[PDB]
Amino acid sequence: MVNVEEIRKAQRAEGPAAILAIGTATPPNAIEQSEYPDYYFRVTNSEDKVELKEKFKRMCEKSMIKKRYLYLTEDILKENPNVCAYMATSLDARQDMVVVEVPKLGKEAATRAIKEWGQPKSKITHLVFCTTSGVDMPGADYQLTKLLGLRPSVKRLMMYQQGCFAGGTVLRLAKDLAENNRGARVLVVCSEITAVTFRGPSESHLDSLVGQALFGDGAAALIVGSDAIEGIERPIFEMVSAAQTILPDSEGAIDGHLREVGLTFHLLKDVPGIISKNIEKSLEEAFKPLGITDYNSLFWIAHPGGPAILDQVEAKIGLKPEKLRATRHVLSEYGNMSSACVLFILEEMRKKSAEEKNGTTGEGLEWGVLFGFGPGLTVETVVLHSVEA
Amino acid sequence: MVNVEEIRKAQRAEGPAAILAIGTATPPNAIEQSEYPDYYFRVTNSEDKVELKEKFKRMCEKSMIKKRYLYLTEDILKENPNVCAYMATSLDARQDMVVVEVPKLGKEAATRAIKEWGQPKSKITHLVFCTTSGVDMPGADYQLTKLLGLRPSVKRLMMYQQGCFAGGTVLRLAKDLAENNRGARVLVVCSEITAVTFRGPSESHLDSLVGQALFGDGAAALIVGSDAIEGIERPIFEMVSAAQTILPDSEGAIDGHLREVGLTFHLLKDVPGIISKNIEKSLEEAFKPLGITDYNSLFWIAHPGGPAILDQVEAKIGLKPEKLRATRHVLSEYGNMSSACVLFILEEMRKKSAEEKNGTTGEGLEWGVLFGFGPGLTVETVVLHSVEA
Description:
The structure is a homodimer.
Chain A: H1 4-11, E1 18-25, E2 30-32, H2 36-43, H3 50-62, E3 67-69, H4 74-79, H5 81-84, H6 91-117, E4 126-131, H7 140-148, E5 155-160, H8 166-179, E6 186-192, H9 206-214, E7 218-225, E8 237-246, E9 254-259, E10 262-267, H10 271-287, E11 299-302, H11 307-317, H12 325-334, H13 341-355, E12 367-374, E13 378-386
Parallel strand pairs in A: 4-5, 4-6, 11-12
Antiparallel strand pairs in A: 1-7, 1-8, 2-3, 6-7, 8-13, 9-10, 12-13
Helix pairs in contact in A: 2-3, 6-7, 10-11, 12-13
Keywords (chains A, B): Acyltransferase, Transferase
Protein name (chains A, B): Chalcone synthase
EC number (chains A, B): 2.3.1.74
């Protein structure tokens, strides 16, 4: 009767997966980085710590961040004083905020992506939801499904407690979902809210302090699919390959623990040095098979974990000073939004390329690379193809 | 130069994903269910609550569970008295146990699966790790990678805080990973440790009490891959399709929150009734395309959330009394091991089928169905194809 070989050929999709739409959203309130050290040491009641404040001023001035959007307001902090301490029990209060706000912000981003896409919500077949802020059952994927009114039977993948590399991961995931399933349209959402990590300062833990200087909130959403319907859907970027690796002997370079005091962060040794030392190996594995050896001929998307990472990668690889313009722009305007960052950078890049009338969505270039960096020292490497503009 | 269309055709695999190996592992200590009511009310210092103890006795006697394996021993509870209270802050103590024990147990199962597979560990290209017990960064996937000595560059998917349906989810995930990537061999691990949910009894929360009667520990591992190398690798079950849906108007049927007191569980209304009312719709969606309408002609794997779910599905669908033998056997010998359960049942089924000299790994039958049930009231439905013996 029926053969699994024929079933398999019919159920799989045809060509490479493409990003068909992008949307972004942030909390309403942006705080200027120039103002943040005064603000932070005030609402954490740490004005006594003059030495520490001077270090944090340097951190914020060095961050190359102009502003960040933050769900956490002074009013919310007044209501939650255990969140303001370096270490006070506050996991429940932080969860109460984030289990609601993460899918809410994610919905805002998704609605925008779906608007650009222009297709009925009912055509979405898959949902990949990613966050590093909070956990619950059922998860944020379920909540977003309900908020948006997606079909029941949407195939969901809930990616919790992922960390900063996961912008690459959700792309790796959506690629396989879209390419292996003929009519698949994958909604991808990364939604990040720093209420789970915000805390007061400790002179014993300066690395936690740098986190307070860098992390901001935001959500990004994509529609990903193979075999775009002509005249109706329009690819923006196509995916070619997606890799992931653990950088050698980088054990506790970036750690995060979910405790009674919320999510703690540890950031040790030469994270910028570790990434810079190793990144060319990931470049070569990705591009040597394509016959590409000049990395300046690529359009670049890198997770802006901090400006020192970008600077040292640029110096190591010998990138022209403007290659990381898009990445530095979202670092400047949004700060480090963990997993969502890299997707904001894709949006920045295709918008700027259009306004500057480059020939393609990737700054006029054909091939590009997207990097996520995060705990494990994990690096995600996605090879992208631009589309003619 | 090179065209992405040809690259795509070369980089994807040919046939359907197959389970190539199965391994399981449990903590060393099993507690007889006949002894559990006395034990539990003793170590939680609740012997005063005679009324509640009799209720719990009814629960354990009704559970159709003979024993469970438990990482938590009386010695560990004595060292962690805040875990024994119904409500005491204890998340840190539970995380400390589970962030270590979950990948440790997973490694045991994985080593067993790899032994059966018989191929070098270095041939593993992907790792899907699933747990509902604890979260950390980097995750249990990173830890398992380090424990097993997998290649860096193994492509990892860390599935946290998933719940009891996730045995289905990891199959759904591994299917797309294996089928979309030509040489891919996917290590799948589900590892579940109930130290995160163990707590004392409360007459105000009887639904928490049923969890104390049902949940046990365990880990299961699979190797999944397409295009098995003939004479070297041996498919056990092949995957045909994988679906996921949210049962209508089942809102708070199964909830779990991760709080300062650990993981709390809420289990409301007629979970068995909700599942039974809706399950034929998932059967029909899965099997109508294959021309199959007699659900007794399938080999069955169902998540044993409780014996009432099994009994009511059986009655509703009109299943022969022996169809759920394999599922009921692992319920009896292991209890409810959340996401790992369904994988233990696959192992039971193919082992029993072999010892009974049935014509196939699925009790002599060609087609089968695997169900995962969990929060959202989510049901995962996987269509399986057995292999000749």
